[PDB]
């Protein structure tokens, strides 16, 4: 009786939903099977086949917006899309080692909420891994890592010409952050991480405290590994003005010395939030940043 | 001194100073408070020394001197403070102290995010030539709280130990844990010269929350015979017990007794022992205040 398809919702299995909420609460992350219709994936995938980096992929927003209610329920937050990034790269690719996204979320207060959706555009198989590994925050409460990173940033802006090459100074500084080498992290986590298989319309949801890494792709298929990565925050997530101060100050040292700008000026959310800040901020909330506020309803749940 | 005289003696802590201590505390997580104690009372205390575990309750006589000052400390910090333990520390002039640390250990029995703090009361004058005092770093320079999760990770790696992986004590010492990578040089490099070190007259004390990186300084042999100080540990009325960490302390403790037929050094802390027992007997609530041994002394442990 297709009479009632119109009055019915394409709803997710309520029991499964309850489980994702339990899982997210355990690990800080959950893999969401069939969060998207194949159709939708093919639409998005097909459209790709067809200051500006800020909005360049906003056509993804509407697909994401339909799911915020689910994610809001899962996390107990009131989520707000900040940025859609397309992350593609060749299969034999060396990525970053386990990390928490202290850069990705540099524009937010450490204690305030941040999270991501990793949306693979091409299937992820047990062969040809090519996806993502991740550690529960029960095992690795990634929050402390942010404080370590801040201590590092403050050390960075201690440099002066007298101390030789800037970048080298930074790479060689004896900072807690530099101490935590790849081996120390591998030793910490050991094998208590997960990696999963993803069919299209599957996504990985994880808050900013989840230590994680991308796995390289096997040549067989496909050509590249394509994924959307979507940064979210909560309705009450605040800016960190001091961190933004640190970056500006580092950006002066860098250009004054290499006559060029650090590559993080390529993070459009960072640039966007920094300008708003310098221009003076009535409010600590990201929601109150004029460009965010203007597009508010598009960034949030129905 | 006389009874009559009590009606005309004046304390003298200008509300200006008091308000300065509040600003310093809000800035650095610590403040040095001069003349917080009557020269007399220091003399009183010196004299007395000369004349559930015993250590847990041993120096309770000091609580009355402390308790008069909790209202001051409560105002400075914004907290409702509660005395937990009084301990004596004395050492010989040349002594190898422990390096920069934050007292994850001293306060291991509490939730990381919950309030903890200490009063260090030197029982001998600390002078610039002879030293033997403390160095400390603002929490704006080094925010200690992150060190707590490093410590927890290390404790967790400690219980992954197994007979096969060799000697227990060596394992812990050799583990490639973040905790083990944060060495004195890395700490030194992190704070550079951002620490203070003040001189103290009898009646002055140092106050600092559990996030302040700090360490004891050696004494020059000339001035004094020993380094005598009292360290009072205090917690907020709402400070909660960390049952998970204490669970970890237990598994780990069993590993030692099976292997070495003995217990780790951290069991020397009478407060940790006490809270652990209470946890084992079952907590009525997460609050330190609800532990019977605390509950019974509540008034004595808190401000006027």
From TrEMBL, chain B:
Superkingdom, taxonomy of origin: Bacteria
Residues given in the record as Fe(3+) binding sites: 101, 214
Residues that bind 2-oxoglutarate: 120, 216, 227, 233
Name of the molecule in the record: CurA
Native species: Lyngbya majuscula
Residues of the full protein shown: 1600 to 1917 of 2311
């Amino acid at each position: 009786g297709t009479e009632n398809l119109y009055f019915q919702s394409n709803a997710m299995n309520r029991e499964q939903v309850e489980q994702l909420k339990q899982e997210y609460e355990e690990k800080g992350y959950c893999q969401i099977k069939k969060i998207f219709d194949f159709s939708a994936i093919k639409t998005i995938q097909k459209t790709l086949d067809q200051a500006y980096d800020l909005v360049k992929y906003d056509f993804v927003s509407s697909f994401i917006q339909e799911k915020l209610a689910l994610l809001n329920y899962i996390t107990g937050k009131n989520l707000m899309i900040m940025h859609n990034a397309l992350f593609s790269v060749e299969p034999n690719h060396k990525g970053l080692p386990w990390h928490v996204g202290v850069g990705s979320f540099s524009f937010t207060k450490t204690e305030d909420f941040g999270a991501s959706i990793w949306i693979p555009l091409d299937k992820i198989t047990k062969e040809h891994r090519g996806g993502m590994q991740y550690v529960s925050t029960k095992i690795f409460p990634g929050q402390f890592y942010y404080s370590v990173f801040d201590l590092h940033l403050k050390n960075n802006i201690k440099w002066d010409e007298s101390q030789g090459d800037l970048n080298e100074y930074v790479a060689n500084a004896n900072t807690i952050y530099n101490k935590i080498t790849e081996d120390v992290i591998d030793y910490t986590i050991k094998d208590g991480y997960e990696e999963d298989e993803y069919n299209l319309g599957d996504a990985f949801f994880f808050n900013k405290y989840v230590l994680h890494q991308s796995v390289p792709l096997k040549p067989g298929l496909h050509k590249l590994r394509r994924a959307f990565v979507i940064r979210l925050v909560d309705y009450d997530t605040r800016v960190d003005e001091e961190r933004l101060g640190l970056f500006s100050k580092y950006s002066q040292l860098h250009s004054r010395y290499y006559k060029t700008l650090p590559r993080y000026n390529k993070d459009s959310v960072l640039v966007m939030v920094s300008r708003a800040v310098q221009k003076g901020l009535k409010s600590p909330y990201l929601r109150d940043i004029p460009h965010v506020q203007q597009t508010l309803a598009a960034r949030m749940a129905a």
